[PDB]
Design a protein around this nucleic acid. Structure first.
Lengths: 49, 86, 129, 77, 79
RNA sequence: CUUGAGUCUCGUAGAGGGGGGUAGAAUUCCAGGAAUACCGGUGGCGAAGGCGGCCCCCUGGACGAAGACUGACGCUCAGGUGCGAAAGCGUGGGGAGCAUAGUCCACGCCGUAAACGAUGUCGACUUGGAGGUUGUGCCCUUGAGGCGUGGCUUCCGGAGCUAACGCGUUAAGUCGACCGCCUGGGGAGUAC
């Protein structure tokens, strides 16, 4: 949830959250980890803003 | 609630060690954990979801008291002495 | 069982009369030894062995002569809450008397001939055919 | 008691008042994108031990402060 | 001695007079079911020697009062 | 007496709620009302109506791995009492997204509906096959992985059953204990 590497490699370049239906993988923990991702400032708000 | 203060109240009532689910030890653990939970329903006063979970064990508190009543009239009175019930 | 040990046994046996398994097994009270020590002797099934002493439990051997299976139509009648204590000169003969009629007499459970030989009826346990 | 964790965000032009604020809020330890800013700072985090009430005095001192904007508390068991 | 009809005590708020119910089975006459049925009949006794909740042996007697024609013989149960 | 049930230990997963403030991937007026884009789904929670931003606070249920002891202590329900989609109405305000109050919070009435698994509840038994998801034992774990082995939920199907259509190990199949309800259509959810 807190890692800049292991979360931003598994976000999409449109800024949004990767679905597991395309990634294929812990996801139910990873989703809520990226649900709270917006305040950490190791990421942008999204890729377009 | 569940671990800490229950561990100091368990051996207060057991006829020996690890007789935990005996009916004396049962209700006195349980009735204690209706007073303290009623501190939580001393306020919040809109949690109608969880209030039945309180209403669950209040009726079972009277259920096992029947099991003291029908078997041993002595031990029945002894714990409601120690708890001040009804 | 929860709320009749002998009714819920009689579902367990004739389900073996619908897939033709060899051995059947149910948790066995001391009444339940006295059940299948009648069904064996009248010939409806073959052999049984009680086992277990903290779970006393049976090993009944079924009996299907063909694709046809021998125990055709067994029915419990006196179900709890509908006791039918038969006086003996009413007695249910099962299928014009061609079967047997398991009656809980005083002198035991083994009952074809309580009509004349023993001479006292009681609660029906189950018809057997 | 219960273990906890402290998460907050630090003002860049008053990043020089980090350890002075630390020893102020270490009293409870001993007691028991445009966000209108540069998006460049340094973080200070630690895993704390304090129970349910010793913590409650800490957060209610941040509506009177101007450097930190968001107060976030989590756990790891 | 009649059958020595066993019963209970329901209430005593009366002056030397009690209320007895009697457990009683029966075949229900058309369905064939056993309904535990109970009656309620006043019973004379002087000493107040049975309490509310006992088990009582009862025979008949001369009709003493209105609504009460049964004397106590003895008690087989404390409260 | 130990298997029905039940308490403890111990972990596990989660739109179960209540309060508290928070606050943008977004959005009209000159300020702020709203509430998720993404994950979002055949997922997942709960007794149902239901409930989705984020973190902590008091609380709710279930689950698994073992031990331990209680010795039938249970299952069911007429009345009974709670929780009760919308609106309406009451009293106390607001006014954008946009229906001119009302919708929105809130304190009181109101209990209404496709409140339709159009499938009371618990228990035990019977051919099955493929996927869901949560675990966790053994096994070079040598791994994404096998055999089990828990729990619930899908999808097609044997026997049996059903007027068919169909159901089909989460039953409607073989049963047992208990509760609700129906006995031709209209007049009618109406007269008093």
């Amino acid at each position: 949830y807190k890692d800049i590497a292991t979360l931003k490699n598994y976000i999409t370049e449109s800024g949004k959250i990767v679905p597991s239906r395309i990634t294929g993988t812990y996801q139910r923990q990873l989703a809520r980890a990226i649900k709270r991702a917006r305040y950490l400032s190791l990421l942008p708000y999204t890729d377009r803003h | 609630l569940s671990t800490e203060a229950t561990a100091k109240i368990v051996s207060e009532f057991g006829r020996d060690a690890n007789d935990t689910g005996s009916t004396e030890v049962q209700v006195a653990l349980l009735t204690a954990q209706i007073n303290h939970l009623q501190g939580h329903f001393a306020e919040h006063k809109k949690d109608h979801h969880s209030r039945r979970g309180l209403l669950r064990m209040v009726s079972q508190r009277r259920k096992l008291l029947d099991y003291l009543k029908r078997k041993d009239v002595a031990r029945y009175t002894r714990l409601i002495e120690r708890l001040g019930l009804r | 069982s929860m709320q009749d040990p002998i009714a819920d046994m009689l579902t367990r046996i004739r389900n073996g009369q619908a897939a033709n398994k060899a051995a059947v097994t149910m948790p066995s009270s001391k009444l339940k030894v006295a059940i299948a020590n009648v069904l064996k002797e009248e010939g409806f099934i073959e052999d049984f062995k009680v086992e277990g002493d903290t779970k006393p439990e049976l090993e009944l051997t079924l009996k299907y002569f063909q694709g046809k299976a021998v125990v055709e139509s067994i029915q419990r009648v006196s179900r709890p809450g509908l006791r039918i204590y038969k006086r003996k000169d009413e007695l249910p003969k099962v299928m014009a008397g061609l079967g047997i009629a398991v009656v809980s007499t005083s002198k035991g459970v083994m009952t074809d001939r309580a009509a004349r030989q023993a001479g006292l009826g009681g609660e029906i346990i189950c018809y057997v055919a | 008691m219960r273990h906890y964790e402290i998460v907050f965000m630090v003002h860049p032009d008053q990043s020089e008042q980090v350890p002075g604020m630390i020893e102020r809020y270490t009293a409870a330890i001993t007691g028991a994108y445009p966000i209108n800013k540069l998006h460049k700072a340094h973080y200070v985090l630690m895993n704390v031990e304090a129970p349910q009430e010793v913590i409650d005095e800490l957060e209610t001192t941040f509506r009177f402060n101007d450097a930190v904007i968001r107060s976030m508390v989590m756990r790891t068991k | 001695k009649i059958r020595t009809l066993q019963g209970r005590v329901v209430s005593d708020k009366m002056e030397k007079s009690i209320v007895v119910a009697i457990e009683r089975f029966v075949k229900h006459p058309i369905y064939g079911k056993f309904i535990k049925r109970t009656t309620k009949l006043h019973v004379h006794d002087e000493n107040n020697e049975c309490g509310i909740g006992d088990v009582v042996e009862i025979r008949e007697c001369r009709p003493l009062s209105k609504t009460k024609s049964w004397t106590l013989v003895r008690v087989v149960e404390k409260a």
